């Protein structure tokens, strides 16, 4: 046998014998990388230099017997010299071309199977569909996406075990495949890889690529699924979007997530409409997910989601009135709740702002290996009855119910290193973070939750923190039922004008209020096909496109604002912006801005095009009279309140006077043509409700005053007010 003969020869040589005998297998990892050569600091230069010499390539010694030393032209394909630091010999590129020309051919039917990922890229690009290219003010946000979806059912370790089985069955070790998915994929791969001469290392690397999920932080603007990320360069550009639909099958999870995102955006946008039901219907009939119409995916996609359910109700489809959480499908059998954000301090001394649900409510929990009935109040688990098949399932159900309760002891039970912001400092979902932390370890949570006296409740034995069943004592409000209690029914519902879903009896099942406020990213690119293409985009895109639309239509917007501002405010183009405006402050902001616009109209001159551009979107909502003074207007953006400053320049809304160009969130929105009627002349008169800005202060009418308390002035008097970025200015209460 060749290899044993080589081993005998190596043992024959004294120095190689000493190396082989002395060095251990552990020490091999160190001496394997033993190299005198150093990494080339500028490989491009070295490569350019070495392509001029005769023999820059190195090949295995066997080349000398399987390639002639020279071709018919006499050019030496290879030489006798031995490559430095190895037994390989020197070779010219001519040798490689000769091998590709008249070399020994073999079978390559296996290559597509082992390089499955690359040929899948080829195939799904072949069957992709190209739509029109649309030139739009693209706003790409940097976020983690997946480049290699991997085999989701199999974690990285399972993928490694399968790779060892398939490629190196003898070197597996003690590992045994348990997950059925492992067995099936190992089987198919072994059958496919039969008599594969390709190097086992390459097969292992390709299998690692195919199976192990890999993610990457990339600036994206469409779907974040792999089928869309790999073609990201082709699809999304700086100023254009290429409507592309990759061919082949699409993971059901990605379509479900994208449908949820689209439904959330549509309902959130449709709430601020004058006819929310009709608007929602129009965005449903005009939206497409992954190249598929959104109208016909709801009737075939049972994904449970209050937004998806509202959309289904709008089309007459029976809803479930359920929602996923922690892997369990929750159906609210009875009770009602209202969302409200509230700040909590965790057990690890970290401060969180979690969305608490005020109100008593009762849920039915359905899981893959568990089922429970829960009743909770505001941050209080009134009762929980679990019916898990095994202790692990019971523990999972109990932990999920515990976290879902949002109880203070739950929050205070956090211990160790738990971070609620990723490495990009993006705010994570606190509920998901708590679920992950407690599923990793729940000893502290059960210890700090409490124990309740339990009587001999028939078929409802209590459970203790150590997971052993008990009769007299149990976790507070937690019981375990052995009746295997085990909802899916789709009840037909009627949805009113304002998207309030009521069953036959008339109780409000779903309302837009309980729709999640998070602004997630779709897995599959979502395309909207109305006149204003940006209705269902993220916050930044909506802001930029709203201001860009105002700029473009500025010629008509000016005249409409001067002679008929009520219709300008009605303009639907501002509704998505209002969707970003917080619901509580919408009316007050609209009233304040409308009053400022009216005073600007009344006062001769003092016209400010940039100010109108800045404040016009906020005027869409119905006015709400108030005396409060606004230093900035707030808009929701990915859970952050962006403050648009009424007076001055702020990063959210910028007007570069040198270029006369307006940039929103760092994205250019266009330039404002010079308006001879502007005539700012220092005085603005469109900053404070009922006040006129004289200009720089003069330290005779008063030292300084604050914006809010400035309302003390009665009429006519002049005073200095601290408004803006530390720029005290003189003001006066308008005559009327």
């Amino acid at each position: 046998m060749e290899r044993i003969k080589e081993l005998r020869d190596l043992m024959s040589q004294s120095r190689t014998r000493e190396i082989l005998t002395k060095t251990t297998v552990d020490h091999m990892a160190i001496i394997k990388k033993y190299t005198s050569g150093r990494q080339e600091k500028n490989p491009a230069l070295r490569m350019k230099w070495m392509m001029a010499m005769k023999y820059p390539i190195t090949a295995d010694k066997r080349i000398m017997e399987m390639i002639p030393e020279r071709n018919e032209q006499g050019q030496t394909l290879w030489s006798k010299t031995n490559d430095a630091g190895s037994d390989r010999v020197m070779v010219s590129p001519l040798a490689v071309t000769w091998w590709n020309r008249n070399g020994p051919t073999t079978s390559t039917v296996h290559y597509p199977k082992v390089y499955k990922t690359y040929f899948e890229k080829v195939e799904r690009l072949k069957h992709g569909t190209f739509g029109p290219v649309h030139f739009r003010n693209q706003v790409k946000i940097r976020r983690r996406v997946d480049i290699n979806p991997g085999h989701a059912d199999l974690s990285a370790k399972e993928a490694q075990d399968v790779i060892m089985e398939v490629v190196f069955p003898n070197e597996v070790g003690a590992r045994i495949l348990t997950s059925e998915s492992q067995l099936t994929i190992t089987k198919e791969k072994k059958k496919e890889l039969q008599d594969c001469k390709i190097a086992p290392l390459m097969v292992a690397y390709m299998l690692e690529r195919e199976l192990v999920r890999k993610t990457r932080f990339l600036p994206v603007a469409g779907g974040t699924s792999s089928v869309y990320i790999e073609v990201l360069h082709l699809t999304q550009g700086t100023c254009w979007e290429q409507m592309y639909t990759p061919g082949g099958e699409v993971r059901n999870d990605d379509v479900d997530q994208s449908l949820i995102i689209a439904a959330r955006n549509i309902v959130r946008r449709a709430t601020v409409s004058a006819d929310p039901l009709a608007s929602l219907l129009e965005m449903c009939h005009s939206t497409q997910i992954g190249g598929v119409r959104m109208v016909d995916i709801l009737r075939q996609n049972p994904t449970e989601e209050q937004a998806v359910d509202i959309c289904k109700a709008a089309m007459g489809l029976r809803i479930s009135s359920s929602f996923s959480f922690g892997g369990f499908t929750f159906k609210r059998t009875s009770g009602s709740s209202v969302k409200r954000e509230e700040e909590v301090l965790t057990g690890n001394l970290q401060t969180l702002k979690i969305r608490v649900h005020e109100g008593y409510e009762e849920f039915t929990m359905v899981g893959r290996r568990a089922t429970a009935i829960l009743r909770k109040a505001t941050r209080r688990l009134i009762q929980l009855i679990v019916s898990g098949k095994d202790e692990q399932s019971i523990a999972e159900a109990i932990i999920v119910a515990m976290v879902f309760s949002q109880e203070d002891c739950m929050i205070k039970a956090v211990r160790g290193d738990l971070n609620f912001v990723n490495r990009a400092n993006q705010r994570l979902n606190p509920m998901h973070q708590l679920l992950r932390h407690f599923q990793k370890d729940a000893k502290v949570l059960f210890q700090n939750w409490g124990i309740e006296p339990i009587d001999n409740v028939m078929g409802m034995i209590g459970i203790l923190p150590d997971m052993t069943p008990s009769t007299e004592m149990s976790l507070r409000g937690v019981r375990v039922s052995k009746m295997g209690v085990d909802s899916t029914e789709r009840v037909v519902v009627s949805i009113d004008r304002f998207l309030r879903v009521r069953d036959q009896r008339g109780n409000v099942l779903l309302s837009p209020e309980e729709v999640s406020e998070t602004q997630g990213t779709e897995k599959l690119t979502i395309t909207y096909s109305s006149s204003m293409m940006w209705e269902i985009n993220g916050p930044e895109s909506v802001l930029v496109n709203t201001y860009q639309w105002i700029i473009r239509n500025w010629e008509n917007v000016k005249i409409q604002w001067s002679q008929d501002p009520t219709m300008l405010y009605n303009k639907m183009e501002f509704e998505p912006f209002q969707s970003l405006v917080p619901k509580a402050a919408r009316g007050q902001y609209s009233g304040f801005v409308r009053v400022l616009f009216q005073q600007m109209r009344d006062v001769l001159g003092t016209f400010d095009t940039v100010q109108i551009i800045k404040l016009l979107p906020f005027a869409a909502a119905p006015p709400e009279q108030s005396r409060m003074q606004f230093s900035s207007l707030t808009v929701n953006v990915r859970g952050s309140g962006m403050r648009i400053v009424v007076r001055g320049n702020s990063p959210v809304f910028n007007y570069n006077k040198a270029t006369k160009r307006l940039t929103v969130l760092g994205k250019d929105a266009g330039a404002l043509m010079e308006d001879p009627d502007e005539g700012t002349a220092g005085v603005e008169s469109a900053v404070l409700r009922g006040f006129l800005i004289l200009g720089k202060e003069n330290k005779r009418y008063g030292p300084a005053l604050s914006i809010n308390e400035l309302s003390n002035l009665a009429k006519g008097e002049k005073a200095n007010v601290l408004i803006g970025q530390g720029d005290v200015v003189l003001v006066m209460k308008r005559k009327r």
Binding site: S324, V366, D441, M467
Partner: peptide
């Protein structure tokens, strides 16, 4: 029968010992 539509988080629990 009983099935989970979408299960986030790592799952399991170290309390069981």
């Amino acid at each position: 029968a009983a099935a989970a539509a979408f299960a986030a988080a790592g799952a399991a629990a170290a309390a069981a010992a």
